[PDB]
């Protein structure tokens, strides 16, 4: 009955889609949106798994709704949830302060920190829908 | 559920990507043990998804064409010949290997190989929705 929209991968309740383009954090956000979804939350490892599996054949950076203004500020996903902590560490530009803030994305498995302002891809995801 | 968790539902089929990297034949009988085959295209429709599909990666992608030698036709598993222009198959055309003269798709382009040559594949059956 379609869990979800063509060209979309479906795992678990969610579904995900691969960035087009590579803009800053700020339009890759926004794109989700249009997209009626959310950049890429990371729950538990599985999930985690489930991405890097989905990637692991690239190395390019992929965005990810993880970020924070500066270091005073802890790592936030775009709902407000804060990070489960043993999920990953965070790497990259740790300890600076930009304009646009800090912003975490994925790349060849690990997670960093870098310049929101910096374009890169994304993943988007939205709830799947189990209605038939 | 059109397609099974993990795949990518497009048009008619489902697309997977491969895990592993072997050669044609092992490549292919992966997507048999899937209920699949390897990727056919059938219009540049098809290509222009598949290639925005692996736009993130810069590994070669096996697909269900092949051939002996230059004296053979390519084909796709179901047998069926090559849709005239859908695309053109660059790579080694003039050399025939021992294994067959298998067809991969990397970085938008599709060129010929060495059939026993490791690579990911992409695998597709029919999606559902009757």
């Given at each position: 009955m379609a869990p979800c929209p063509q060209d979309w991968i479906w795992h678990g309740?969610?579904?995900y889609l691969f960035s087009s383009g590579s803009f800053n954090w700020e339009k890759?956000?926004?794109?989700?949106?249009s997209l009626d979804a959310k950049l890429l939350k990371?729950?538990?490892t599985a999930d985690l798994d489930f991405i890097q599996q989905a990637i692991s054949y690239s190395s390019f950076p992929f965005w990810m709704g993880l970020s924070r203004r500066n270091?005073?500020?802890?790592?936030?996903w775009?709902?407000?949830s804060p990070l489960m902590p043993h999920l990953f560490?965070?790497?990259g530009a740790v300890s600076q302060t930009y304009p646009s803030g800090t912003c975490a994305y994925?790349?060849?498995g690990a997670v960093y920190a870098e310049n929101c302002i910096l374009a890169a891809f994304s993943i988007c995801q939205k709830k799947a829908n189990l209605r038939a």
């Open positions: 309740e969610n579904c890759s956000q926004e794109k989700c949106l990371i729950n538990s270091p005073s500020y802890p790592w936030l775009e709902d407000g560490r965070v790497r994925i790349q060849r």
